[PDB]
Every structure is written in C-alpha cells, then in structure tokens.
C-alpha cells in the first residue's frame, strides 16, 4: 500500500497512508530515489500518519513524495553458505559474489529462534594468545570484552583471534562472525585482504560497516552478526565466536540519532536508553538449547577520551565473562600487548579451570601473580616517593616481580602458549618472590609445583 511524506526533519520522516497503516517496525521504501532508501516505522501519530526513522540521508525528499510499505521489518538471509563471504552491515555482498541464497529468512532483533539454554558457559576456546588462554581463559558462551583506547592495537588483537581461535578436542564445528562498525575504506580493504589471504575466511562470516555508510546500517550491523551466530550455533550446532569492533563507534551512531528522536539527553549527552539498547546486544550470548553449540562474544570497548568511566564502556562491563583492558600508559612503555594486569578480570573463570580442565594449581597461581603484580605496581609509586635505595629488600623483590611479569608473562613474541606453558612461566617468575611471601598458594601446591 502507498503513502506520502507529510514532514521531514533530518532522520525523522512522517508519512500519511490513505489505506492500510503499516505497523510499527515495518520497513517502508521511498519511491523516486537513486539508491534504496528505507524508512522504519516508529510510531502511529493518529490521523492515518506514522512517524518513521530513515536508514539513509533524507536530502532531496519532498512533501508528497511516495512511499510503499514492504509488509515486514528488515532481515538475515540465513544459510551455512554465509561462511566464506564478506558482507555490508545490512548483509549485502562486498566480495563481488552473488547475494546469499537463504535457507531461512530471520528477523534480526533477537526475537527469532529463542536459541539460548538456561545453562552456564563452560569449556575452552583456544584464542592462541597466552595472556587470554593462560591467565584470563575465554569460555564457550561467555562475553569477554577487549577494553582499550584510541591509538592502541585492539583491532590487531581482534583480527588475530579471528584467525587463530578454535575449540580443541569438541565434536562441534567452529565458526567466526566478525563485525566491524564505522571503519575507514583503508581498514575495510585491510580486513578483507587479511581474511582472504590467511584462509580464515573459510570458517567466517564477515560484516563490514564503513564510517560513511548510513548510521542506521551501523545500528543493524551487530544484529545481523548476532543473528547469523545464533543461527549457526542453534540450527547447525556450532560453537560460534562473535567479534564486534568497536562498540563505542556503534554507540556514537545510536547517540547521534537520539537527539533527532526528541529525547531529553542523559549524562555526557548520551541517549537515556543507553543501557537498555546495549542490553539487547550483551543479552545475546551463552550456550544454546541442545548444548551442541554456543554463542561467545568478544566486543571491543574503546575508552572515549581514554575514560573507562564514560557511560558506554562502563555499562558494557556487566555483559562480559572475561575483560582484557588495554592501557595507553602501558603501550607508551613499549609493553605489548598493552594489557593492564590489575584491571583485566575473568567473571566465569572459575568454571573453566582446575583439575580435568587446565591444572589443579591454576587458581592459586593466578591469584598469587595478580596479588604480586598489583603490589609491585604500587611499589613503583613508592620508589618515586622515597627513592629506590630506601625500599626494603622484601619490597624490592615485589618491585622486580612486576617487571618480570611484564617482560616475560605479559609479553609474548607471537607464539601459541599452552596453559601448561603459561603456568610454567608463572611459576618461574614466582621464584623471584620469597617462598614465605606466597600467601595465596597452599603448601600442597608449593611442594608439588614450585
């Protein structure tokens, strides 16, 4: 059925229908445009008029311009053949290949499938990075954010995990869904080339949204990605790893429209709905029904202005099972990966460690290294206050341990460390500390492993 525009203000367009009003969420198509222009119904204003939000620019629209109702919202052309393809934020080909041949056509908001089970995340995902696998293990079904800032190699880490991740002997096949949001043409060309050259593309679906793509397409990108992941996990029984960079850029777009939508702004100019939209994305992870598959997330959260308290990165922490926080200060000291060892945590870590999983001494070693590194970092402050020579012999050992932790445990010369390798390095550096100062390792472990 067809309607006519009665008002246009930036991204918001009002459209009057003489017959049949399109329901909220329907995709409408503007007639008379060179490129497809979608209007998503947001409200029924009364008097046969609906209020909509445009998925692309509204320059050149005229009052009276015609609009058709497509009869449905937007969707994902779901198929196992999604693997090996590079697509836009909307799921249109970017690889010069034909459009996807759907096995099913799925809504993308998270309503389709109802895939999740009421079971806890469990079992190992080998990223191939020692600072994740050994000390902050990623588990199937978990949401483990990379916490970074502008200038830091968070995207290099994200791409490396995409190339390397696997689920070591699992009866289930493994797949990656890689979604990039608001990236440059140069970055898009780089990501494409990387997936194609390495052969990582064979087991991955890639969604790329450019900075100059419509803001609405950026908002839809993570939803296309999560829907594909849930389809592969639930209908094909796969362990799927979803990598989303950068959530902060997603937020900049969602924030950009909140103003055009008429809302009173919240703190820092953000949308008042920041946490309940973001919840629609972090809720979508975990084991799927049947327990053959799972959806795991590695979202990238860059600190705007390096501020981890900004509402965006701060609200993301609750959606994760493991967090890796990168720090500019550490990067400027030449320590890469620039992980803050006293601000990276594992929420579900205890579910993936110990006898029959990693090794019985894993929790004790992790606790002792964390405690010693935190003390060592504080002592760097104390050295600055009093001078190196005024530090006690005991404190000097903890000071030195912090350097050893950074030089040998954090730093990897690119290199796939087994958990056994990572625990060995951990015990080697721990020897620097007095045995009498290992408060967090029971004597049983000292005798057996020291």
């Amino acid at each position: 059925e067809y309607t006519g525009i009665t008002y246009i203000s930036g991204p918001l367009l009002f459209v009057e229908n003489a017959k049949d009003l399109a329901y909220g969420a329907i995709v409408d198509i503007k007639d008379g445009t060179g490129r497809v222009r979608g209007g998503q119904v947001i409200e029924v204003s009364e008097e046969y008029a609906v209020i909509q939000v445009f998925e692309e620019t509204t320059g050149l629209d005229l009052a009276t311009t015609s609009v058709s109702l497509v009869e449905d919202v937007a969707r994902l052309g779901v198929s196992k053949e999604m693997l090996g393809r590079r697509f836009n934020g909307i799921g249109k080909p970017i690889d010069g290949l034909p459009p996807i041949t759907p096995e099913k056509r799925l809504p993308i908001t998270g309503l389709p499938l109802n895939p999740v089970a009421r079971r806890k995340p469990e079992q190992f995902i080998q990223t191939g990075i020692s600072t994740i696998d050994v000390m902050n293990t990623l588990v199937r079904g978990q949401k483990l954010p990379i916490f970074s800032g502008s200038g830091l190699p968070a995207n290099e880490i994200a791409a490396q995990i995409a190339r390397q991740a696997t689920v070591r002997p699992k009866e289930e096949p493994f797949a990656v869904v890689f979604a990039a949001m608001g990236i440059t043409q140069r970055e898009l060309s780089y990501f494409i080339q990387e997936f194609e050259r390495t052969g990582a593309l064979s087991r991955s679906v890639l969604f790329l949204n450019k900075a100059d793509d419509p803001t609405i397409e950026r908002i839809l990108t993570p939803r296309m990605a999560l829907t594909v992941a849930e389809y592969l996990a639930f209908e094909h029984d796969y362990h799927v790893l979803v990598i989303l960079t950068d959530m902060t850029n997603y937020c900049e777009a969602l924030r950009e429209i909140g103003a055009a939508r008429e809302e009173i702004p919240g703190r820092r100019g953000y949308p008042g709905y920041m946490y309940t939209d973001l919840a629609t994305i972090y809720e979508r992870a975990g084991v799927v029904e049947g327990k053959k598959g799972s959806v795991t997330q590695i979202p990238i959260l860059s600190m705007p202005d390096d501020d981890r308290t900004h509402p965006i990165p701060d609200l993301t922490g609750y959606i994760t099972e493991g967090q890796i926080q990168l720090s500019r200060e550490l990067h400027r000291k030449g320590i890469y990966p620039p992980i803050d060892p006293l601000p990276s945590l594992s929420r579900l870590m205890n579910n993936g460690v110990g006898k029959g999983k990693t090794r019985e001494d894993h929790k004790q070693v992790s606790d002792q290294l964390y405690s010693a590194y935190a003390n060592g970092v504080d002592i760097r402050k104390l050295v600055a206050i009093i001078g190196e020579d005024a530090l006690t012999e005991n404190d000097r050992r903890y000071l030195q341990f912090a350097d050893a932790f950074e030089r040998f445990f954090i730093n990897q010369g690119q290199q796939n460390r087994s958990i056994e390798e990572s625990l060995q390095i951990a015990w080697a550096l721990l020897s620097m500390l007095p045995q009498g100062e290992l408060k967090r390792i029971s004597k049983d472990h000292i005798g057996k492993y020291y």
Binding site: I264, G272, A279, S371
Partner: protein, 561 residues
C-alpha cells in the same frame, strides 16, 4: 466498554485506548496479541497504556481488556519453586489452577476474624503455607472447608455470611501491604561475613544499600547472603540482566545448594527476572511484586531477604515510561516523582508483629549501579539517602585481592549500635569495642599512608611501622575473605570474633613489645604471624589457641630482649 476497550492509536510506545471505563490507574491491561500493559493516564476520552513489550504487535482497533489487578499479584499456594518475571507469570497464569493442595482447617464456624487471621494451613512446599483472611475483611466465619484437597479457585470459607475466601488473594504491587506496626531494629541479620556482621551490621527488617560501579561484586554479596544469611526465605529480583545473565541464572541457580541443608537454594527462593526485552512496566512492578511476596512470607513468621539487582535499571525503565507519557524531565531527564516512590518501597522493609501475633521480617539489599562511576542519579543518590546500611565494594580493594572487597572507610551501618547487643549477649561481650578498635586501626593506617605518600616511609618511627604492620594483618587476615574456599566462603559469628581477638591481641602485644624496645623487624617475622594469616582457612577453634601461642612467642622475644 467498561471492562474492555479498543486501541485508538499506537506509536511512540504509548497505546491510546477508547473505553476501559472501569479500569483503575496503574492496572495491568491485556492486548489481544497477548502483550500486557499498564494503565498510566486516565483521561476523559481515553486511557494511555504503557506497553510491556513490542508495540508493533499492537494495531489500531485491537481489543484491550482489564485484568482488574494493579498491576496485581496472586498470593497463595504455588508461589514456592515458581519462576516469574516483572509482572508475575511463568518464565499466562501465575498459580496453578489444576494443582491440588492439602488444606487444613485452623478455624471453626462461629469464629470472629479480621484481615491477616490464619484460617487454614497448606503444606504446599515445606514451608507450610498460611492461609489468611485478605486485608480489609472481617466478621464471622459462617462456612469453612474440612481437611481435604482443593484447587486455588475453590472457596474454602465464607465470612460475614458472604465474603468468599480462597487459598490465594490478589494485591496491588504498588501498594505496600498493611500491618499493625513496624518494630525497632533490634536483631542483626547474621550474615556470617566478619566485615559486615562486625563493622556494618544489617538488622533483620533493615534496608542496607549495596552500591558501586559495574563489576565490583555487588550481586555476589547478595548471592552469598542467600546461600548463608539467617533468613528462611530469599526473594531475588535478578533485574538488570543482559547478554546472557538470564540464561546464566536460568539453568544455574537450579543447581546452587543451600549450605544449611544441602538441598537446592531455589527450594527456599523466588526468582523475579527483569530482562531487556521486557517492557519498562514489568521491571518497574517487579520490586513491588517481590516485596509483596516477601511481606507474605514474613506474615507466616519467617525472616526473608529481598535482594534487588537493581534499582538503577528500574529507574531507567520508569524514566522510559515517563518520557513516553510526556511527563516533564528533570535532573538526568528523570521524572520528579521518583524519590517519594523509591522511599515508599524501602519503607515496606522491617521486622513486624504479624497479624495474630508472631514476628517476621523483610530485610532489603538493593544493588546500586550509577550510569558509570559518577555515583549520582538515579540509583545511588536517592538510595543512599534512604538505606541505613551501605557496603561499598571497592574496585581498588578487589584489584589488590582483598576480599571481601568492602571498603571499611567508606561503608556505614547506622545499624552498628542497633545490633551490638545481639552480638554482646549471644557471641561476645567485646564485639563493639573490638570493631571500633580495628576501625580506628584502619583509620590511622589511612592517615599514615597519606603522609608516607608525601615524605616517604624512611622517617617512620617504630611505633608507626607497627601500626602499619598490624593494619596490614587486619586487611589481609580479616577484611579479605575467599568466596571460592570451601571454608572461608562463610565465616560463622563465633569464628569472626575469635579471629578478631587474635588480631587485636597481637596488636596489644606488638605495641607492648615496641614500648620495651623490641625491634619491629623481630615482631614482623614472628612465627605465629604466618598462622594468623591462614586462620581464615581453619574450620576449628584451634584459632583462639593462637592467642596463647602469640603471648608465649612474644615472651620468647621478651627473653632474647
């Protein structure tokens, strides 16, 4: 058009409805599609309804029907083991209509009754459910069922020759259930955690806010309390769920055990989920549905704990509903109405003398999640002004591996004096003096560390080095607790004081030895110190033996001089 209506318009989240002439303000209404909504605005020619779900499933002309309940709740047999949501309904009915319950008459025909009176008992789930005359109903019992089996809808009794009573009843979650009086905070809610029970006590029927940034351990304090606190029943409103925090609890908690009995914790719990796909309306009503269920169990003479994950998300859901209703935004765009409402919620907490005597209580522990460290509005600000207790999880204390990560400098219990006598009479005569002394230690350490940050630690006298030594032992040996250890996961009241006296006794001996020119370096490497450090791991009183072991060891230091 009295009991039903028809959608005039929908978009912008508000459904305008023609009719519904008898609907109450704040009543749940039902759309033909199956969605629920709350009557927000009653106008001369429409009802404005907040939709608790997606409004594209609503179209102009759609039929709308009253539910008759305030947003209401069903209160009767079938509540236990049940899993609901923001507006009570299987994770749709509320209480099984088919399930048969063994009703036991506890009143005879001719008895005079009043609201709250117990007329029957149902072993629905051990727990024994107590059937009460609904509030606002009194008179003479003219008819009463005999001991048998009946479904909820059946009538078990008639009063004043015709009000009919069933085993369940309905109540507006928005209205706090009536009571004769609220008793004064007298009995501590024995947590088993030394820092809490000692320094920041919670009283049975007290409101103690849990506040701090995301990932500081707020929920974990709540979960440990439920696994070990001295409340018979727990009402968990696991709100602010996201990404998978729903499925994280869906098939997980059904396995968590009751440390006290070794049975599922759910066997004494009621879950109230608040997911993101749920309407702001449901999450808003979730605390009211929970508190009402909480008040229901305390009426039986049980001490229940109400854990609210969290109110920050409830105020965001409420701000969404208010802005959609075009109510004037204030600070952070929150409606003016929130402060009085939030306060009204926490006011329903307390230990009471239930209808027909007997004592029960509802203790509230609410999570605080500011937009991000700002710790202002909504959540924190308004909450910290109501609650009497605040346990500040400190991310810096956590990074330092000091557990529980509760900041002993920023936390407060207005309840310390309120609960001191329970500890003095039942645990130890010196509970209050001991915690005051430890806190003064920690207070002194804080001041010393500030100065050392400036002039360095080299000028420190032996007396000041000793205070830092003992202050450190308090932090590492007492404040820090290992939630993952099979033993230190829970610290009984008896164990908390015994560990305190070992530390305080080591302090006195330390200061006494220094005063007699004993090198602090000699005390710092005293053999008993390593044992004091592992005391939290001992499950036997072998811990108080450390006091004598400490004294003799200092004597061996008085010997060598």
């Amino acid at each position: 058009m009295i009991q039903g209506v028809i959608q005039k318009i929908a978009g912008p989240a508000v459904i305008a409805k023609g009719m519904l002439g008898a609907r109450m303000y704040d009543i749940c209404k039902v759309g033909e599609e199956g969605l629920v909504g709350e009557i927000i605005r009653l106008d001369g020619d429409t009802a404005f309804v907040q939709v608790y779900e997606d409004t594209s499933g609503l179209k102009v002309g759609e039929p709308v029907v009253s539910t008759g309940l305030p947003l209401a709740v069903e209160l009767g047999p079938g509540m236990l083991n049940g899993i609901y949501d923001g507006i009570q309904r299987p994770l749709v009915h509320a209480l099984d209509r088919e399930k048969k319950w063994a009703w036991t008459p506890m009143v005879k025909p001719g008895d005079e009754v009043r609201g709250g009176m117990v007329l029957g008992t149902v072993p629905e789930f051990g727990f024994t459910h107590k059937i009460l005359v609904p509030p606002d109903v009194r008179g003479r019992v003219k008819e009463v069922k005999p001991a048998g089996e009946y479904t909820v809808e059946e009538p078990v009794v008639v009063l004043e020759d015709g009000t009919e009573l069933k085993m369940y009843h309905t109540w507006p979650v928005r209205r706090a259930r009536p009571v004769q009086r609220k008793l004064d905070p007298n009995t501590p809610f024995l947590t088993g955690m030394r820092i809490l029970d000692v320094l920041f006590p919670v009283a049975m029927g007290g409101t103690a806010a849990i506040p701090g940034p995301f990932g500081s351990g707020k929920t974990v304090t709540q979960q440990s309390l439920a696994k070990w606190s001295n409340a018979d029943v727990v009402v968990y409103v696991g709100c602010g769920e996201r990404g998978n925090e729903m499925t994280d609890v869906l098939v997980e908690f059904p396995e968590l055990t009751d440390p006290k009995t070794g049975g599922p914790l759910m066997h004494r719990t009621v879950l109230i989920a608040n997911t993101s796909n749920m309407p702001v309306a449901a999450r808003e009503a979730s605390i009211y549905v929970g508190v009402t269920i909480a008040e229901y169990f305390r009426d039986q003479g049980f001490s229940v704990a109400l854990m609210a994950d969290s109110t920050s998300r409830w105020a965001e859901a409420l701000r969404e509903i208010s802005s959609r209703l075009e109510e004037m935004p204030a600070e952070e765009g929150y409606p003016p109405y929130l402060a009085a409402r939030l306060a009204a919620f926490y006011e329903r907490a307390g230990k009471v003398i239930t209808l027909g005597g007997e004592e029960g209580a509802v203790t509230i522990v609410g999570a605080v999640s500011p937009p991000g460290g700002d710790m202002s509005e909504p959540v924190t600000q308004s909450t910290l002004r109501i609650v009497g207790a605040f346990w500040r999880l400190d991310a810096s204390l956590a990074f330092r591996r000091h557990f529980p990560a509760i900041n002993w400098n920023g936390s407060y219990s207005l309840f310390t004096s309120a609960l001191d006598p329970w500890y003095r009479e039942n645990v130890a005569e010196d509970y209050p003096e001991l915690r005051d002394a430890i806190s003064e230690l920690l207070q002194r350490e804080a001041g010393l560390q500030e100065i050392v940050q400036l002039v360095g630690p080299d000028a420190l006298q032996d007396a000041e080095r000793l205070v830092i030594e003992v202050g450190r032992i308090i932090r590492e040996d007492f404040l820090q607790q290992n939630a993952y250890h099979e033993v230190d996961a829970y610290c009984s009241m008896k164990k908390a004081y015994g560990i305190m006296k070992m530390i305080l006794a080591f302090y006195k001996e330390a200061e006494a030895a220094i005063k007699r020119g004993v090198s602090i370096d000699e005390i710092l490497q005293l053999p008993v110190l390593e044992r004091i450090g592992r005391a939290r791991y001992v499950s036997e009183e072998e811990f108080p033996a450390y006091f004598e072991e400490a004294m003799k060891e200092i004597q061996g230091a008085f010997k060598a001089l």
